[PDB]
Design a protein around this ligand. Structure first.
Ligand SMILES: Nc1ncnc2c1ncn2[C@@H]1O[C@@H]2COP(=O)(O)O[C@H]2[C@H]1O
Ligand SMILES: Nc1ncnc2c1ncn2[C@@H]1O[C@@H]2COP(=O)(O)O[C@H]2[C@H]1O
Ligand SMILES: Nc1ncnc2c1ncn2[C@@H]1O[C@@H]2COP(=O)(O)O[C@H]2[C@H]1O
Ligand SMILES: Nc1ncnc2c1ncn2[C@@H]1O[C@@H]2COP(=O)(O)O[C@H]2[C@H]1O
Ligand SMILES: Nc1ncnc2c1ncn2[C@@H]1O[C@@H]2COP(=O)(O)O[C@H]2[C@H]1O
Ligand SMILES: Nc1ncnc2c1ncn2[C@@H]1O[C@@H]2COP(=O)(O)O[C@H]2[C@H]1O
Ligand SMILES: [Cl-]
Ligand SMILES: [Cl-]
Ligand SMILES: [Cl-]
Ligand SMILES: [Mg+2]
Ligand SMILES: [Mg+2]
Ligand SMILES: [Mg+2]
Lengths: 462, 462, 462
């Protein structure tokens, strides 16, 4: 009796799970919303500097209208290799955001010290990897982490919250190119007999200099010991897989739950109802970057209800005005929503007008939500890259472009109001007196925005 | 000199052959029609109970308009595993019909006894396999089998005929859930020193209790002995393949012959002229289930000409009224044609009217065909699953739904006339006096049909 | 720490490189145009006789409108196996032209003798391979070879030039079916102690009879010695690959350079923006076969500027009149351009008129280009096969059909004028007095053209 070749089976549930971390795929938690979970771990925030400039250049004539295709190919070639290292070292990629990603090693408290060594080794190998134009910056943090799941009956989003989350982003902001920076708490928890550092001026964070193994040390045996604490590390018969999620089997309940995290247009491609090519594009869109600030951004039980409340309104008005949520995460002393007008399928004219009217609506509503202290919204329009970024086994739909960064910086440098760039202003059908021309601020990571405006809106205020 | 990787070659001829059994792929018989062949073998009829209920539930809001995709994934995940067992145990899957299949082990007469043991072992392993909602029933028969191939210059169909065919379906109808039932002839031919059974009340068929190997018995060596008699069992260099048909090589003559069995829309997908997604759908259709009854349904040389004659008319009027033959097989003391109006591409309004006019046309014509004793036709309309069911190496286009079962039961409980359900009646553009409201019958496997009608047709009859 | 499965990565750059030889993929030469390179090597010109007849037959009713699909499948099944042999024996496939191909073994002069033995062995194995209707003819030549790259800022073409190029085609023209013929220079350079030949009447070329290895000879060890001189022979870890180009990694500069050789419609398929099925078709087109004759067709520095100059005009007027260059190569004492009107996407009516007006335009322009001695153009219209021919790792878009051959023969037998077949004449919207009916010539490889015409054009000439 034959024992024939079992082909890898690429069920729709496996393709869906590629868009999600193990934290969701294997979480089995309540469908109640908001839902909050608490744990400990190590976080790693990896940023490629320089793709957003490459993006601009891929629209030029030399790319012969295949700029989107060239960009996604070169981006994924690099990002894939980072994703593989994270996964082989036992991490869960939580999220991609443009040309950056956030990874987690969830463990019990007593295992933090050793897992931190694993994550540093991983980070140093990633620095190893990387025309001669892009750099990799890495921030690490460790400690208590909260997760929030929010959403409605057909859509789900999650994000992580707390000091370690705030620290991982601060650490990465300080990294100079090719640095690995540890948060103060990470440095306090780590194996100081192995990890040599250098102080960072005016900071308590530190920079990794090198690993100093002791005399008997064997990294592979140490790593094996740490894998005891890793619930989903592929092993035994599945030791040749990058993710245990590759072995998921059809299960309608689980798939119904997982699909709610993934955008319709991506589900259409998964279901072989649209060609893959269509979702990689360099197209004019409008970004609406919404920031919600709280008194205490580290306290999930406080902020969770508020984010849910805001989300319910946001999703409704985005649908009316033809926009979509691309990403949600903690940033800017708050929860930020990256919303997009003009994604695959969602084109119109008066897209600009809509973006602005939607932004004012969100601003008015969210400003009255209990515990939301300040709302800021940045609106910017231009050509942006949209497509699936990452590895075959772990990837997500994302946007990359100078206008994405501009909207986020506007939102940060002009708090408490709705602002817009020049393209949005000049293109909208709205009267000029609905706007106010603003003082120009020097803004970290933007060479020249053109004039910026406040969208003051309809009735006068003075 | 290198000896490089020979990639599996997925020629169009191999993809076509996935839709067909070895009985056709390797049959090389005459293109004359009708064509009849005679042989012996063991048949296995495997039924999953409960998908037709799941079908209804996959249209509900909780599936978020991906019901078709979820259904086909969960169905195929289960059916594939049954298909693999059949193929590894040396069987040829002849046909899928909804959530059921029919398999054959063709052998010389002297080998029936031992092959019956192989098929029982296979069936018991299949019971082994199988939310907690579906059951597997299995009927086995053995003896003389006839095959009929019929069709025209561009379309071919086959079916199997005779007592063993009738017996395999009777056996499976008696199976309670997870039973394997042997036909009287199967039980009479089998190795009684190994197969322990239990009587079935008011029947001569028997139920398998268990296998009782004797002291020296080794199933793998016995199986090896039986493979001597299996013409196409994958072996040697190809022992890692589930089917020898995976190795078919381009050959325009053979492909011209094989493609005539496969529907145009499936050929379009094979030829990468339409996305795979498009053929899995849950869509409103009209089923027209036609039964032709003969004096002796087991005598191919008698019934073959008649089926061919009926087929020629049926295919012509279906084309006029925009329907298609999905399946043909022996059932209901006769040859049944499962015809569908509304398949991928074939949508219209007045689809209901057409179905009914076509059914009356077929009824009038077939009733005059020599040797056709009675025609019955059931017409029912609702949401049904349409798509490719089975394993990658062996699969077919099929329909599944409560309206499919309803049309078949109508045809069986209301012989000699054309009947229709309420949806068809209320939706057609036909005057009410073309119909007669009928007494409601309690019908095995239908909880509530709503009112049923005879399509009496145009001129009065009284 | 796991060392998981590295999946083959099918980047867009690898798919592009499938359409190109190593000579371009690894050439890294100047973007200046014309560019000329000089080297030595052995050439092999392999022709399948009989596909062009099969082509006609695949349009007939018995193929049930899947003629294009059947043709490409049977063609590629055979061509692939020849491609594999060429690649395993260390050759670079330069170009496909219909059901023929041209391969090169580039080596230093001192290695020609031994490489010629490798190529003969390869050719003899290819004869080995091959309803019972097609024959393989092979011509071999060896010596100095020039390459010309020409084109504009977004399109590139290359071709090879010189005596060896002319000789390989002459050699193949003399081959009777299943012969391998050596050019005079090849026979003069080869290892005469191993290669036994037979004279060819009225020729200095010779026919291979057989290989006569000497007593100690081991072909595999000899082949290994010859691989020292092969720059891109897959080896070591990549010894299981048919081409080193399978390992190409994303690199935007290189991809920008390579894509310029490939047609837009093929790039669209590579980019998963169109289904594969669409490019295999049997469709009515118009072929415009343009021949440019020079005083000395073997002198690249002389003819290179002229081809570039002609190309710049040709590409411009083809774009105005909706045609495309399919292929360019040396043939007919000149450089020939195979141009097509009606390819995927480029349909119109007055396609015939356009073809003819474009041909006259090209004729008038090219006749004044310095060093172009005579222009001849053949225009023929009918059903032709269009699609991707070759192996997965090395394939190209090509056209096959009796009208392709007819246009080339017209161009050759009616030099110095623009001619057209009957279909083109009768279908064009042009007045009859713009044409002249011509004497019918017996034309090698055409049984009956129907009447042929000179397109005399608008103003009278007498
Ligand atoms: N695709 C994207 N998704 C999410 N955030 C983005 C994206 N592109 C840019 N950003 C944000 O732009 C910000 C610019 O300032 P920072 O670098 O502090 O933090 C950056 C990100 O949070
Ligand atoms: N693992 C370690 N344990 C103790 N001291 C350290 C370690 N790594 C670095 N240091 C010292 O900590 C210092 C902090 O300031 P400096 O970077 O000037 O130089 C650093 C080292 O001298
Ligand atoms: N897709 C299908 N193809 C063929 N027959 C079907 C399908 N769905 C239901 N049936 C028939 O419906 C019948 C209901 O009664 P039985 O179970 O006796 O036999 C069943 C089948 O023959
Ligand atoms: N292989 C076998 N050979 C002989 N007798 C059998 C076999 N299997 C079962 N039986 C007996 O046949 C009987 C028929 O009726 P029962 O099921 O009541 O119990 C059954 C067993 O006692
Ligand atoms: N697809 C094609 N591409 C290029 N040339 C072709 C094609 N089909 C036929 N030919 C030419 O047709 C010619 C007929 O005469 P020859 O055989 O001398 O040379 C042949 C080729 O050069
Ligand atoms: N490798 C070789 N070296 C020397 N002579 C040869 C070789 N191969 C063939 N010949 C002879 O060359 C001859 C040329 O004419 P013939 O073909 O009549 O017969 C041929 C052989 O007799
Ligand atoms: Cl997050
Ligand atoms: Cl059947
Ligand atoms: Cl060439
Ligand atoms: Mg970045
Ligand atoms: Mg069933
Ligand atoms: Mg040819």
């Amino acid at each position: 009796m034959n024992t024939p070749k079992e082909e890898f089976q690429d069920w729709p549930i496996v393709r869906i799970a590629a868009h999600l971390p193990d934290l969701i795929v294997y979480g089995h938690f309540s469908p109640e919303r908001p839902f909050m979970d608490y744990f400990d771990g190590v976080l790693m925030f990896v940023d490629i500097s320089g793709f957003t400039a490459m993006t601009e250049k891929f629209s030029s004539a030399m790319y012969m209208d295949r700029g989107a295709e060239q960009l996604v190919e070169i981006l994924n070639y690099h990002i894939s290799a980072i994703v593989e290292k994270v996964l082989i070292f036992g991490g869960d990629i939580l999220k991609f955001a443009g040309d950056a990603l956030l990874a987690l090693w969830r463990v019990e408290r007593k295992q933090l010290k050793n897992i931190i060594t694993v994550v540093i080794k991983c980070s140093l190998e990633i620095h190893g990897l990387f025309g001669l134009d892009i750099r990799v910056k890495i921030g690490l943090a460790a400690g208590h982490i909260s997760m929030l799941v929010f959403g409605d009956e057909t859509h789900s989003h999650f994000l992580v919250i707390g000091q370690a989350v705030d620290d991982v982003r601060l650490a990465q902001n300080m990294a100079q190119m090719n640095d690995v920076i540890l948060s103060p708490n990470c440095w306090q928890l780590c194996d100081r007999s192995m990890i040599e550092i250098e102080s960072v001026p005016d900071q308590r964070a530190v920079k990794v200099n090198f690993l100093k193994p002791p005399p008997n040390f064997n990294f592979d045996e140490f790593f094996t010991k740490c894998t005891t604490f890793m619930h989903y590390y592929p092993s035994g018969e599945h030791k040749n897989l990058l993710r245990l999620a590759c072995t998921l089997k059809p299960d309608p309940e689980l798939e119904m739950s997982l699909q709610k995290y993934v955008m319709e247009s991506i589900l259409k491609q998964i279901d072989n109802k649209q060609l893959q090519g269509y979702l990689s594009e360099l197209r004019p869109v409008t970004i609406v970057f919404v920031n919600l600030m709280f008194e205490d951004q580290d306290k999930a039980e406080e902020i969770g209800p508020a984010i849910q409340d805001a989300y319910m309104h946001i999703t409704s008005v985005l649908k009316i005005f033809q926009g979509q949520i691309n990403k949600v995460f903690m940033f800017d002393k708050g929860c930020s929503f990256l919303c997009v007008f003009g994604f695959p399928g969602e084109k119109v004219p008066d897209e600009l007008t809509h973006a602005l009217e939607c932004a004012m609506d969100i601003f008015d509503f969210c400003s009255q939500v209990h515990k939301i202290q300040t709302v800021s919204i940045g609106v910017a329009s231009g050509i942006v890259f949209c497509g699936i970024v990452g590895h075959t086994v772990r990837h997500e739909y994302t946007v990359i472009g100078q206008k994405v960064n501009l909207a986020a910086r506007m939102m940060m440098y002009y708090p408490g109001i709705v602002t817009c760039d020049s393209v949005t202003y000049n293109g909208s059908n709205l009267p000029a007196y609905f706007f106010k021309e603003l003082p120009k601020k020097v803004m970290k990571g933007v060479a020249d925005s053109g004039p910026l405006y406040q969208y003051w809106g309809r009735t006068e205020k003075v």
